[PDB]
Amino acid sequence: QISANQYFEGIYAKYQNIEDMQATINFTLKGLKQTGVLLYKFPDKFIINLDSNNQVFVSDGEFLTVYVPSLGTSFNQQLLKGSSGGGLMKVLNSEYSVSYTNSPNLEDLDSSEPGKYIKLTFSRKLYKGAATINSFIIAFAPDGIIRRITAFPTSGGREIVIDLTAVKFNVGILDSKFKYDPPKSSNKVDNFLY
Ligand SMILES: [Cl-]
Ligand SMILES: [Cl-]
Ligand SMILES: [Cl-]
Ligand code: NA
Question: Residue 73 carries which side chain, given as an amino acid letter?
Answer: T
| Exposed/middle/buried for residue 13 (C-beta within 10 Å: 0-12, 13-18, 19+) | exposed
Domain that includes residue 39, residue range: 4-188
Ligand 3 mean position, distance from CA 52 (Å): 26
> Is residue 193 domain-resident?
no
Ligand 1 mean position, distance from CA 124 (Å): 26
Here the CATH number for the domain that contains residue 111 is: 2.50.20.10
CB neighbourhood size of 162 (10 A): 20
Ligand 4 mean position, distance from CA 48 (Å): 9
> Is residue 140 domain-resident?
yes
* DSSP classification of residue 176: T
> Is residue 73 domain-resident?
yes
> Is residue 194 domain-resident?
no
Ligand index nearest the alpha carbon of residue 185: 3
Ligand 1 mean position, distance from CA 139 (Å): 23
Give the technique used to solve this structure.
X-ray
Output the DSSP codes for 122-154: EEE-GGG---SEEEEEEEE-TTS-EEEEEEEET
Backbone φ and ψ of 11, nearest 5°: -55, -55
> Is residue 18 domain-resident?
yes
Distance of alpha carbon 180 from alpha carbon 194, whole angstroms: 20
Q: What is the resolution of this structure in A?
A: 1.9
Ligand 1 mean position, distance from CA 158 (Å): 9
Ligand 4 mean position, distance from CA 27 (Å): 15
Ligand 2 mean position, distance from CA 175 (Å): 33
CB neighbourhood size of 47 (10 A): 21
The structural domain count of the chain equals 1
> Is residue 9 domain-resident?
yes
Q: What residues does the ion ligand 3 have nearby, CB within 5 Å?
A: 183-184
